Amino acid sequence: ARRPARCYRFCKNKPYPKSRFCRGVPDPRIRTFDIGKRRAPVDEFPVCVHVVSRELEQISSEALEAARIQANKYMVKRANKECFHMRIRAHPFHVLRINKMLQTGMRQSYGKPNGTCARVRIGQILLSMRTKDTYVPQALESLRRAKMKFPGRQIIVISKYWGFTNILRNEYEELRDAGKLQQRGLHVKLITPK
RNA sequence: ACCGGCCCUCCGUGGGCUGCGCGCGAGUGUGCCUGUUUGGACCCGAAAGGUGGUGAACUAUGCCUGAACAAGGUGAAGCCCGGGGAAACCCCGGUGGAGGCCUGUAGCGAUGCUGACGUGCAAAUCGCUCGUACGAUUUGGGUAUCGGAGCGAAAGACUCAUCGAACCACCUAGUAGCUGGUUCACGUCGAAGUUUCCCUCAGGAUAGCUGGUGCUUGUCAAGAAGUAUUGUGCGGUAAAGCAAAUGAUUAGAGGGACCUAUUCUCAAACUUUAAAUGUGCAAACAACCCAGCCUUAGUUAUUUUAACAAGGCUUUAAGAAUUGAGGCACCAAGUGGGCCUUCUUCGGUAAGCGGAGCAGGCGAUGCGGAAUGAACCGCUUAGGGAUAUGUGGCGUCAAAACUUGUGGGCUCAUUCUCGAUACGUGAAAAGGGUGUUGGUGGAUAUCCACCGGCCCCGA
RNA sequence: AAAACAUAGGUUUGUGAUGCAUCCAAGUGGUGUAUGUCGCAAACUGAUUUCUGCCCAGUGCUCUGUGUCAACGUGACGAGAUUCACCGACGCGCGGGUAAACGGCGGGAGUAACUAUGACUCUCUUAAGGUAGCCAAAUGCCUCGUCUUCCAAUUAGAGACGCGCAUGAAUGGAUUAAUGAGAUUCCCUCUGUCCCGAGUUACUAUCUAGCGAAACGACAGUCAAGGGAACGGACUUGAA
RNA sequence: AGUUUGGCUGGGGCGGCAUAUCUGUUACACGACAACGCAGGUGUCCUAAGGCGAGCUCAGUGGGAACAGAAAUCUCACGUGGAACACAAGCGUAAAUGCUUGCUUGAUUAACGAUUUCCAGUACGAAUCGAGACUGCGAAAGCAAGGCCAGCGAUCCUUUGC
RNA sequence: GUUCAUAGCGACGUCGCUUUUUGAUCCUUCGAUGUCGGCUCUUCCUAACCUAGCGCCGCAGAAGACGCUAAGGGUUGGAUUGUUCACCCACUGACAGGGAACGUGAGCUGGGUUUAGACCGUCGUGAGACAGGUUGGUUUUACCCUACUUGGCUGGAGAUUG
RNA sequence: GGGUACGACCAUACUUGGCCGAAUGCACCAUAUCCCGUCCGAUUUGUGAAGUUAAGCGGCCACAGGCCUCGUUAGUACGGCGAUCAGUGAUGGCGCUGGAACCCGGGGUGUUGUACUCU
RNA sequence: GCCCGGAGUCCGGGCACCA
Numbered sequence A: 001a002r003r004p005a006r007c008y009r010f011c012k013n014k015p016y017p018k019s020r021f022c023r024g025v026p027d028p029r030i031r032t033f034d035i036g037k038r039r040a041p042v043d044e045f046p047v048c049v050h051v052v053s054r055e056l057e058q059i060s061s062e063a064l065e066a067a068r069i070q071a072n073k074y075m076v077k078r079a080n081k082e083c084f085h086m087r088i089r090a091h092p093f094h095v096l097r098i099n100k101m102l103q104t105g106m107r108q109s110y111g112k113p114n115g116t117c118a119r120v121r122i123g124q125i126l127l128s129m130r131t132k133d134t135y136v137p138q139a140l141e142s143l144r145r146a147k148m149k150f151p152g153r154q155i156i157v158i159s160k161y162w163g164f165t166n167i168l169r170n171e172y173e174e175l176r177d178a179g180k181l182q183q184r185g186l187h188v189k190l191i192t193p194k
Numbered sequence B: 001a002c003c004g005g006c007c008c009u010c011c012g013u014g015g016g017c018u019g020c021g022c023g024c025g026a027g028u029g030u031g032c033c034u035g036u037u038u039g040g041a042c043c044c045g046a047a048a049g050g051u052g053g054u055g056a057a058c059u060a061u062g063c064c065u066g067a068a069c070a071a072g073g074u075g076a077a078g079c080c081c082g083g084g085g086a087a088a089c090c091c092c093g094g095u096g097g098a099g100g101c102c103u104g105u106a107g108c109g110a111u112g113c114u115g116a117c118g119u120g121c122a123a124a125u126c127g128c129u130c131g132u133a134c135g136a137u138u139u140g141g142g143u144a145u146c147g148g149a150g151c152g153a154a155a156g157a158c159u160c161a162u163c164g165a166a167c168c169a170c171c172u173a174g175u176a177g178c179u180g181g182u183u184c185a186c187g188u189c190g191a192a193g194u195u196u197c198c199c200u201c202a203g204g205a206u207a208g209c210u211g212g213u214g215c216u217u218g219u220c221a222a223g224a225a226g227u228a229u230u231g232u233g234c235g236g237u238a239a240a241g242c243a244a245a246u247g248a249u250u251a252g253a254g255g256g257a258c259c260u261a262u263u264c265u266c267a268a269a270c271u272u273u274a275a276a277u278g279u280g281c282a283a284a285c286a287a288c289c290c291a292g293c294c295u296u297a298g299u300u301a302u303u304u305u306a307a308c309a310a311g312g313c314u315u316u317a318a319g320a321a322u323u324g325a326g327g328c329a330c331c332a333a334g335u336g337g338g339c340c341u342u343c344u345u346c347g348g349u350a351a352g353c354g355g356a357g358c359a360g361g362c363g364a365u366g367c368g369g370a371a372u373g374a375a376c377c378g379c380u381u382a383g384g385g386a387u388a389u390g391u392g393g394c395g396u397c398a399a400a401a402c403u404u405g406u407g408g409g410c411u412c413a414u415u416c417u418c419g420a421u422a423c424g425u426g427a428a429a430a431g432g433g434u435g436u437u438g439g440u441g442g443a444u445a446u447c448c449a450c451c452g453g454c455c456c457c458g459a
Numbered sequence C: 001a002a003a004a005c006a007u008a009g010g011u012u013u014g015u016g017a018u019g020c021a022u023c024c025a026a027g028u029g030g031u032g033u034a035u036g037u038c039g040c041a042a043a044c045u046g047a048u049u050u051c052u053g054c055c056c057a058g059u060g061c062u063c064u065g066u067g068u069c070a071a072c073g074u075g076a077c078g079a080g081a082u083u084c085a086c087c088g089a090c091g092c093g094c095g096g097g098u099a100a101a102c103g104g105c106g107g108g109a110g111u112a113a114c115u116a117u118g119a120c121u122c123u124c125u126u127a128a129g130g131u132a133g134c135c136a137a138a139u140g141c142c143u144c145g146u147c148u149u150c151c152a153a154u155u156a157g158a159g160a161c162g163c164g165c166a167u168g169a170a171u172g173g174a175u176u177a178a179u180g181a182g183a184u185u186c187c188c189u190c191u192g193u194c195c196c197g198a199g200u201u202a203c204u205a206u207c208u209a210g211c212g213a214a215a216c217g218a219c220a221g222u223c224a225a226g227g228g229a230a231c232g233g234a235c236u237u238g239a240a
Numbered sequence D: 001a002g003u004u005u006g007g008c009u010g011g012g013g014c015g016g017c018a019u020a021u022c023u024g025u026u027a028c029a030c031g032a033c034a035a036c037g038c039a040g041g042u043g044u045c046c047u048a049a050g051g052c053g054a055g056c057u058c059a060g061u062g063g064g065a066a067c068a069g070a071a072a073u074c075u076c077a078c079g080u081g082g083a084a085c086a087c088a089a090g091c092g093u094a095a096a097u098g099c100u101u102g103c104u105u106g107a108u109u110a111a112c113g114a115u116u117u118c119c120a121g122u123a124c125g126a127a128u129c130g131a132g133a134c135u136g137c138g139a140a141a142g143c144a145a146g147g148c149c150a151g152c153g154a155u156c157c158u159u160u161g162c
Numbered sequence E: 001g002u003u004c005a006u007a008g009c010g011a012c013g014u015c016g017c018u019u020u021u022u023g024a025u026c027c028u029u030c031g032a033u034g035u036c037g038g039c040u041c042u043u044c045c046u047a048a049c050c051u052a053g054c055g056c057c058g059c060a061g062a063a064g065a066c067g068c069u070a071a072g073g074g075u076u077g078g079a080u081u082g083u084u085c086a087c088c089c090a091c092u093g094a095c096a097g098g099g100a101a102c103g104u105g106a107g108c109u110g111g112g113u114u115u116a117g118a119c120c121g122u123c124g125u126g127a128g129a130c131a132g133g134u135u136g137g138u139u140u141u142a143c144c145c146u147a148c149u150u151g152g153c154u155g156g157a158g159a160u161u162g
Numbered sequence F: 001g002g003g004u005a006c007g008a009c010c011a012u013a014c015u016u017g018g019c020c021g022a023a024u025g026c027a028c029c030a031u032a033u034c035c036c037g038u039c040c041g042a043u044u045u046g047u048g049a050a051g052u053u054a055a056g057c058g059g060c061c062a063c064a065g066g067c068c069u070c071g072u073u074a075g076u077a078c079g080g081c082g083a084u085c086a087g088u089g090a091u092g093g094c095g096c097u098g099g100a101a102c103c104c105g106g107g108g109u110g111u112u113g114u115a116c117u118c119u
Numbered sequence G: 001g002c003c004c005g006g007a008g009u010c011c012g013g014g015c016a017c018c019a
Ligand SMILES: [K+]
Pocket: B041
């Protein structure tokens, strides 16, 4: 088994990523960072809900995978499968080491790569979900259950922007009528004279 | 420039090196203290090494000549008398007294109680029990073999309570980077556990920190400053970026790979950009200008430059520093195990763990506070009065509100018992509460959602 | 005090005296030897019974005809020191012998009418590839191996099995009547070993008369918690 | 008979080399900084892979040509270095420090000149700026006394040159 | 779990407690703090096995599962093994888990571990080695202070005085 | 208002496309006896004027890219010094003080020295 | 390093060692 997560909670070391110097790294537990209807035009989902961290700490890849499974399961059961789209915005790039105990003691104690984790900051957004205005109570409950899989303190807020887009929610449909917006996939670009 | 020595060239009134050289002498004898070295070497201490002698009365083994060993059991060879048989030969009964034979005294030993005693009767003894007891048996006197040697039915056993190398005297006060000790008073000063080298890591040499003796001077300040200001240089950490190069990486879109523009998320060994704190130089007299002048084998096609000089001239508002003794030696001690802390930081799950950076401490140091504590807070110390504070306090212990205010709120806590001085984690989490007390946003003439304070469950 | 040593029995080696072993500073010096192979000196194994397999590649010991190895000799150049050339033994190399000298003595595949196993085959390789025997043995890690017997119950004992980490033949193998203050298991008898302790005796201790030490001894001697060199008699607070 | 039988070290031993040395990072934007901290190298190689002059442009991509294809050779265009520079890494470089070619021996001697790095401001190794001789390549200015920075060694003794 | 997330469980995750395991460290003790197990004896803790009283169930009864107050009382006899541990037989209401210098050697015992003798296997040329097996192997002193158990003498309120 | 030769700073000067270009000049351009060099007078070398601004070159323009400058981001991120400061912690604000970066928005698209020269 | 032997020369032997 792996050690309890209390042994890797605080950001005590330099980032230490996977590179040509650190090679024998196991694969992270989470591989997909999107659930729900990814192929949805930006106009379909106008409501966005965030969960944002309030601590400076590390979150393991197992916890991210546990949160993804729980959030998807509740939305599918309590609502339609296609009525939402969720994105995980924390990728595990920090490698953790372990010193497994022919020599004995603390001699030559540099460890071997064992797992991966994500380093988060205060005010950073961890998960983002966009949905319709009639499924907000379901989205809030699903995110509530998901955040119970993380260490530390997190808060749940509703954004003032149109879903996954940097344009204010009330002012989006004016700039859509008067064609000042160029649609590129899931985001939009403000057209300017240039 | 001159003396000695080694040289170079275009060979001259060149050139460049070297001496513990010279450059109007400073040595020498003696007294005294301190340091280095050898000697017993400040005092006491090994395990060892060598030279010459004394021991076989303990004990080991051989030899000469003497002494000793109750009482029983078993019953070998030889011999006698009877039977059986054709022979070969076989059988009974006696007698006899063999044996590194058996039971068992004396003798010679020492298995168990892991008995007694264990400052004893005794530096190995005592009580029961036990091995053997005609044999490779026990024992007196005499004699023979020893110290790197003797002897051994062999255990490194024994050689006078001494043996994996006896005893006595001497070399010998053997050497010890290691342990222990080292005897009067007051006064002036006062550290280091770091650098480089060492068969170096419990030790030295070397520089640094310190003391003594000074020298040359100055007196408001020279060759002053762990500090500013002004001017002028240096930089790639924190941050930021990936819509910029290198590396890693998620997803849609427009024309299954592919292309274009975007997009989520990153970097100690990535970077266009780029701080704060830092770091170099300058801010006047052995100096700078101005003018004229001399010299050269330097530069230049010549002047003009370069360098060394000599006689005259000038010079000590704008936030616009402020503090004050400068420089130079000689001789020598201790130290060369360090530890703690704010902040920065590497290894480790972590540690009262291991290892670094700038600074301050303890060590070497008390005093006043945190009840108690090397390092925390205050303050740092000649012997004493008066006055006032610092940290911390004013219910009693215990000096101070003889329980201060004519100031607001909040809290009720049943068996490790609510809470109450930081450092000190030197006691606590996720998650909950229609306990009570405050806010924010919505609805209606009180209802919903969310966020705090103290208390309660988790414990 | 033994399973160790010795022992009888067994095997091997040297040696015909101007010898083999060997003392010793030395000599017409000394010991086995007052002896003479049925003797003396040097090793190993350990009664009897039945046996003692294969290996001379390594190391050692030992026996026979030309590369190398020292001084001494014999010639040269040179004025001479110096130098050069040739000759030069045992030994070491070559060639034999020797294991009751020291010692050593294998892997991997396939294969028989249900499965299993493998008499059979192939392959790599050695100086030789462990034979007769014996075993979870005082030698077996795994291991308290697996089966039977002994008990109500056995990591124990005995009897079997054997790809044996790492058994094995005078580094002796296997077996043995008699013997043992040798190690282990079970049975009968017996009991204060125990269930579970009780009563009695003699000498002490205990009191007295006489006599009369030693060890040890910073100072001393009630606790709880705290902090402290992280387990206080002393310090802080409390309680006696 | 005499003497010896390394050291460091989260005890010692086995292991390893942190024992003499080079590059990046830890390292906190001057310099300096530890660990048996991380990622890697060194005891060699080269008469050319040294010196200079000249000419040229690399990696790669796209459009074209019998056999010929994803990949052979020829041609045009783009191409800030994404190639190469003996080897580890960093820095550096485009009519060049790269590639080809021509000629050469500055990889010699160099009067004890001065200096940097480690540092006691000692030595050793490496490197920087000069003076003199004789030369090499260039029309000349000029460049060169090795291959830039790692690749090595006291007293005594032996041996060679003048 | 006939359905039913939560009677009883609960994956993927995440937050803690304890010092009855073993590691990590090297602060105290090397002019010595007697090192396994058993026997004997006392006391403490609760994370409750039995005994008292209750709630709840997928509690009809009987037998049970889960939880609460509660540590007053109780918690065995044997075969094998040095064992702690382990595993069987049997009784019982029940045969709970732990601490006290891994309680307890001037209280015992000495089977094991760990000297000197000796045998075996493997290793080593050898002397010898093995956290492999085997057999044999001295357990010393209390009369001191305190603590505890019993046993006696005797003052004293300004706790000796005013 | 210009050309040529030699330059300094080295993108406000570069990259792409389009348009225009009076004269002097600069070019493209003709050819291989000789000097010289190539597989090839392509480049290079030696000798002429037959044609032409086609290209090179100069000037202007582009909701052009890039580059330069000023604002904004923002007193934000980060920092030096202090507390018997808050918080179980992770961390954070406060006092005295220093102070960024990209995106984004406005503007701009070479300056100039010596000599010989054309209008 | 010396003497050889076998292939201008690489191996196999018997000897010898003060930086
Ligand atoms: K002395």
